Design an enzyme around this catalytic site. Structure first.
Site, PDB file in Angstrom:
ATOM      1  N   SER A 193      77.166  44.006  47.870  1.00 24.80           N
ATOM      2  CA  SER A 193      77.051  44.764  49.097  1.00 24.80           C
ATOM      3  C   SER A 193      77.348  43.896  50.315  1.00 24.80           C
ATOM      4  O   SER A 193      77.834  44.433  51.306  1.00 24.80           O
ATOM      5  CB  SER A 193      75.662  45.386  49.247  1.00 24.80           C
ATOM      6  OG  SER A 193      74.656  44.408  49.442  1.00 24.80           O
TER       7      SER A 193
ATOM      8  N   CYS B 143      68.703  52.635  46.716  1.00 21.96           N
ATOM      9  CA  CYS B 143      68.971  51.200  46.612  1.00 21.96           C
ATOM     10  C   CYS B 143      69.269  50.638  48.007  1.00 21.96           C
ATOM     11  O   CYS B 143      70.218  51.092  48.649  1.00 21.96           O
ATOM     12  CB  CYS B 143      70.212  51.020  45.677  1.00 21.96           C
ATOM     13  SG  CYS B 143      70.741  49.353  45.618  1.00 21.96           S
TER      14      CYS B 143
ATOM     15  N   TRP C 112      72.276  53.805  35.861  1.00 19.88           N
ATOM     16  CA  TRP C 112      72.446  54.913  36.790  1.00 19.88           C
ATOM     17  C   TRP C 112      73.333  56.012  36.210  1.00 19.88           C
ATOM     18  O   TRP C 112      74.283  55.745  35.460  1.00 19.88           O
ATOM     19  CB  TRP C 112      73.110  54.423  38.076  1.00 19.88           C
ATOM     20  CG  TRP C 112      72.388  53.380  38.837  1.00 19.88           C
ATOM     21  CD1 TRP C 112      72.746  52.114  38.911  1.00 19.88           C
ATOM     22  CD2 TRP C 112      71.207  53.532  39.674  1.00 19.88           C
ATOM     23  NE1 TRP C 112      71.870  51.410  39.758  1.00 19.88           N
ATOM     24  CE2 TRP C 112      70.952  52.284  40.263  1.00 19.88           C
ATOM     25  CE3 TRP C 112      70.379  54.599  39.993  1.00 19.88           C
ATOM     26  CZ2 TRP C 112      69.815  52.053  41.073  1.00 19.88           C
ATOM     27  CZ3 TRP C 112      69.311  54.406  40.810  1.00 19.88           C
ATOM     28  CH2 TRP C 112      69.057  53.145  41.384  1.00 19.88           C
TER      29      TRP C 112
HETATM   30  S1  LIG Z   1      69.022  48.583  44.543  1.00 21.05           S
HETATM   31  C1  LIG Z   1      69.463  48.796  42.769  1.00 21.05           C
HETATM   32  C2  LIG Z   1      70.227  47.590  42.179  1.00 21.05           C
HETATM   33  N1  LIG Z   1      71.331  47.072  42.997  1.00 21.05           N
HETATM   34  C3  LIG Z   1      71.649  45.694  42.960  1.00 21.05           C
HETATM   35  O1  LIG Z   1      71.038  44.890  42.307  1.00 21.05           O
HETATM   36  C4  LIG Z   1      72.819  45.252  43.810  1.00 21.05           C
HETATM   37  C5  LIG Z   1      72.634  43.731  44.054  1.00 21.05           C
HETATM   38  C6  LIG Z   1      73.863  43.104  44.721  1.00 21.05           C
HETATM   39  N2  LIG Z   1      73.415  41.749  45.007  1.00 21.05           N
HETATM   40  C7  LIG Z   1      74.280  43.755  46.039  1.00 21.05           C
HETATM   41  O2  LIG Z   1      75.214  44.606  46.074  1.00 21.05           O
HETATM   42  O3  LIG Z   1      73.742  43.379  47.142  1.00 21.05           O
HETATM   43  C8  LIG Z   1      70.777  48.111  40.854  1.00 21.05           C
HETATM   44  O4  LIG Z   1      71.806  48.668  40.842  1.00 21.05           O
HETATM   45  N3  LIG Z   1      69.942  47.939  39.705  1.00 21.05           N
HETATM   46  C9  LIG Z   1      70.332  48.408  38.384  1.00 21.05           C
HETATM   47  C10 LIG Z   1      69.872  47.388  37.315  1.00 21.05           C
HETATM   48  O5  LIG Z   1      69.914  47.701  36.097  1.00 21.05           O
HETATM   49  O6  LIG Z   1      69.482  46.226  37.642  1.00 21.05           O
END
Ligand SMILES: *SC[C@H](NC(=O)CC[C@H](N)C(=O)O)C(=O)NCC(=O)O
Ligand SMILES: N[C@@H](CCC(=O)N[C@@H](CS)C(=O)NCC(=O)O)C(=O)O
Lengths: 352, 338
Positions: B142, B31, B64
């Site tokens: 994040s 990610c 996850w």
């Molecule tokens: S990269 C995988 C996805 N992460 C996010 O969407 C975090 C987005 C926030 N805006 C950030 O922290 O920047 C994720 O975890 N997807 C799982 C899902 O079911 O959508």
């Protein structure tokens, strides 16, 4: 989960001595898809041998559904190198989003089937043999007189086209063109054999593999044999550079071919794969260790020389048909049917 | 979706105060959003302060998942990189595919969410910044987690070099925020809006927008390289690269946030998200140099970048893009040498 291509069922020839299929103008027809590299071979050869007014041409739609290739519901079109399809005259594809899979743009998406009005290529197959039960493939070389399929194997159609069969009906410059000279024939056949299994068909065994083990084996095999072509062309270029000097790019390209020092069927058969490789096979068939343009400088020079400097190649190459056919028809690879816009451009210019 | 847990950590915070051995970072190595936090945790010297665990690269319908000290305080939670065909989606290679969840033995990241908020109804995303004391999620955005990490909050627990690192210096803050703003919409998120589009009209609009904005980043870097070449000479590549960044003449959060997209671009976004006008390696020489410099010369980038997790996650989890789950072997290599 490997891909096992069917063997073509119609394997006859045309000749003066033949009891049924004798040569004539206005008697035989070539039914093709512009997307299909096999059919593409037959369009290049028909143009190089000057047979466009001798053998007419019609073009199926780029979209392949469960019922097979189809037509849409003129003398310039039938005798055009690409059946009159307007995009084949373009050097690059454009936007695709507004083009739906049922698009019906006459002389853009497809031609009609002008002799019987058939909507499906399967109709030609069943007219020839009501008991046919294999796949309904292109290219088809058709005989208007008996209403049969003479030959639906591209490797044979192009030998028919290059043969003396139609010599009475062409100008003497085209008669003299020989894509399979005797001095080169065994080298041509040797080269064709390994390029067939590892590149022409290799990209399909790679892209249609449904198990990752088979995908990996076949993609490694594609790139191992591109390396072999690259080596052949690099050594050939080095010798031409020695002969004529690097500064004489035009004399060098005039002899820059896979087999020998002239254009042959070996170049035609390799080209129809290489010209599709960066537009489709990299993304769509996952043949993506590298691209031609990025990773294979001598193949990339050779293919650009053919595309830009030989009308028979340029004006039978239709990047819209190519990209749309694969990406819109292969639901088990591209489920939503979204055509990638890249790479840009479809084929780079030949910069010196 | 917009992230729900938006708290901070500070000496004045009524609940979440700075301490060693209190907070945890749950990530995926695939990610990019979570990757930002790993890079920042390493740059700020926080690997022993804030432990890390790593979910599996495969993302199924239940979110996850985990497998059933040297590792906790490693830059990548201990994950080591070991063809893909012999790797099935339910692979269980401990400390290769995933870590466990060491505190509660949870198999699913949704378990952490439900513990923090039993009424949670949104998506179970990574990264998660977790408080071991209260057993709650401090923050799961994040862009905020990396500001918490870079802030003065943990200064007591780091050495003097790392305390001094400032990935958001005030002298560059408007430049960083401006760059981050359009890079977020058109590149960080632009590749997802392109790859996840279900209508070609949307795909085409977003992919044009991605490459339009890569062109803007490339110009910025080209202009910066030109001035460095004149100041140091082109043979002195070392001095040039020591100042070759997107904002200013130092390493910042802008570089971090861009990097997590660019490092995934050739290995996956080109083929998988159809962001394929060109590749970074073939089409964007200054981006390409910038990203290789960060990858090969900065351990916080290199040793948090796992190309197996990257390629497997996307190709194996996104069934509406890659129905058979066959991972392309190319491009080769994942990142070219410098
Ligand atoms: S990269 C995988 C996805 N992460 C996010 O969407 C975090 C987005 C926030 N805006 C950030 O922290 O920047 C994720 O975890 N997807 C799982 C899902 O079911 O959508
Ligand atoms: N061996 C044949 C192959 C022809 C072929 O398979 N064409 C493909 C598309 S390029 C086709 O027509 N497929 C239709 C199908 O299999 O349903 C030749 O070289 O002519």
């Amino acid at each position: 989960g490997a891909f096992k291509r069917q063997v073509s069922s119609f394997r006859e020839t045309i000749s003066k001595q033949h009891p049924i299929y004798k040569p004539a103008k206005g008697r035989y027809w070539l039914y093709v898809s512009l997307a299909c590299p096999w059919a593409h071979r037959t369009l290049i050869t028909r143009a190089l041998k000057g047979l466009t007014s001798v053998i007419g041409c019609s073009v199926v739609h780029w979209h392949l559904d469960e019922k097979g290739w189809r037509f849409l519901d003129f003398l310039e079109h039938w005798h055009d190198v690409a059946g009159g399809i307007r995009t084949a005259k373009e050097d690059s594809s454009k936007s695709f989003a507004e083009i739906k899979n049922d698009s019906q743009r006459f002389m853009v998406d497809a031609t009609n089937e002008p002799h019987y009005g058939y909507k499906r290529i399967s109709d030609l197959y069943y007219k020839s043999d009501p008991q046919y039960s294999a796949r309904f493939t292109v290219p088809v070389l058709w005989d208007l007189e008996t209403q049969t399929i003479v030959n639906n194997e591209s490797s044979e159609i192009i030998r028919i086209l290059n043969s003396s069969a139609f010599d009475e009906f062409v100008d003497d410059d085209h008669k003299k063109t020989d894509l399979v000279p005797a001095q080169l024939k065994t080298q041509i056949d040797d080269f064709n054999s390994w390029v067939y299994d590892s590149i022409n068909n290799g990209v399909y065994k790679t892209g249609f593999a449904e198990k990752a083990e088979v995908y990996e084996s076949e993609v490694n095999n594609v790139f191992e044999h591109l390396d072999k072509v690259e080596k052949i062309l690099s050594d050939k270029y080095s010798k031409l550079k020695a002969k004529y000097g690097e500064e004489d790019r035009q004399k060098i390209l005039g002899e820059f071919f896979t087999v020998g020092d002239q254009l042959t069927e070996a170049d035609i058969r390799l080209y129809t794969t290489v010209i599709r490789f960066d537009p489709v096979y990299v993304q769509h068939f996952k043949c993506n260790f590298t691209s031609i343009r990025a990773g294979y400088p001598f193949i990339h020079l050779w293919v650009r020389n053919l595309y830009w400097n030989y009308d028979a190649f340029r004006y039978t190459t239709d990047f819209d048909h190519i990209k749309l056919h694969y990406t819109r028809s292969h639901t088990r690879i591209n489920p939503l049917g979204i055509t990638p816009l890249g790479p840009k451009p479809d084929i780079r210019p030949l910069l010196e």
